[PDB]
Amino acid sequence: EVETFAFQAEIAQLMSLIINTFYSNKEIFLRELISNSSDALDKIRYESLTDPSKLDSGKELHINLIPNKQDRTLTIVDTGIGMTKADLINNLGTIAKSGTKAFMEALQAGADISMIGQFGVGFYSAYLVAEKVTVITKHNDDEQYAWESSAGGSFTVRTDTGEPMGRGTKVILHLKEDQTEYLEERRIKEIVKKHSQFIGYPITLFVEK
Ligand SMILES: COc1ccc(-c2n[nH]cc2C)cc1F
Ligand SMILES: COc1ccc(-c2n[nH]cc2C)cc1F
């Protein structure tokens, strides 16, 4: 049972601007997604200080980067706090509306797309390199959910039947055909070292078989 939702106009406009604007510094998508994972891990680390049982779904706090040349996917996995259904459908987009307006106004005034993180809407930078994005996520208080969007003004949410995730978030970037450089170990290493070298959680770059 798959539910389809329309993005709010302002977010649709942002995604279309990201997809259609000519902008060569696409590699910053990885810094934004890793930064998102690191915030989610901070959040569950803090919550577990006053409630240790919140780590029963998994004590490890880490980020995994998994390229798959066969599926042409790059997956960013974290064991952070995860997202509820209300987050996917409503809350995160509600928050993003003001960041989106501020961002678009800065862009008209001379800012550039690489500054998207300073407006809290960095997640959407994934569409610099992905034609489709799947988010698998599990929060302690909700079921496991699969969110998916190929842009075009809509996204879907369904209960996920795949492997149980414990707690956390898996972002699967279905890469555009001309962006397969981001599946190369040497290229991901370079990007992590340049933009994420001081993240306070272990980042493991899986190598391909
Ligand atoms: C607090 O709301 C959240 C915002 C983002 C995430 C997230 N974790 N890993 C990737 C993402 C996008 C989790 C949240 F709970
Ligand atoms: C479910 O769709 C999402 C909508 C927004 C975000 C987000 N995370 N951090 C900042 C934003 C705008 C993540 C999502 F998965």
| Beta-bridge partners for 147 | 135, 157
Which range marks the domain in which residue 127 is found? 3-205
Nearest to 75 by CA among 123, 38, 127, 33: 33
Separation between Cα atoms, residue 15 and residue 196, nearest integer Å: 24
Q: How far is the CA of 76 from the centre of ligand 2 (A)?
A: 14
- Percent of residues in the chain assigned helix, strand, coil, to nearest 5: 45, 25, 30
Q: Is 97 annotated as a binding residue?
A: yes
Resolution, Å (one decimal): 2.1
Rounded (10°) CA dihedral 123, 177, 137, 116: 0
For a ligand 1 pocket test, name from 36, 123, 171 the mutation site with the most ligand atoms within 8 angstroms of its C-beta.
36
Residue 42 belongs to domain with CATH number: 3.30.565.10
Number of domains into which the chain is organized: 1
The token pair at 35 is: 């930064």
Looking at ligand 2, which residue's alpha carbon is closest to its atom 6?
92
Separation between Cα atoms, residue 147 and residue 4, nearest integer Å: 10
Separation between Cα atoms, residue 135 and residue 128, nearest integer Å: 16
Alpha-helical regions (H) of 50-175? 85-86, 92-108
From the CA of 171, which ligand is nearest? 1
For residues 66 and 77, the answer to whether their CB atoms sit within 8 Å is yes
Query: How far apart, in Å, do the first and last CA atoms of the chain sit?
Result: 34
Which H or E run includes 14?
A: helix 9-20
Q: Is 148 in the pocket of ligand 1 (CB under 6 A)?
A: no
Separation between Cα atoms, residue 62 and residue 167, nearest integer Å: 12
CA 135 to chain centre: 7
Q: Is 198 annotated as a binding residue?
A: no
For a ligand 1 pocket test, name from 92, 149, 165 the mutation site with the most ligand atoms within 8 angstroms of its C-beta.
92
Q: How many residues does the chain have?
A: 209
Separation between Cα atoms, residue 74 and residue 69, nearest integer Å: 9
The single-letter code of the amino acid at 98 is S
Which H or E run includes 63?
A: strand 63-68
The token pair at 177 is: 């055909």
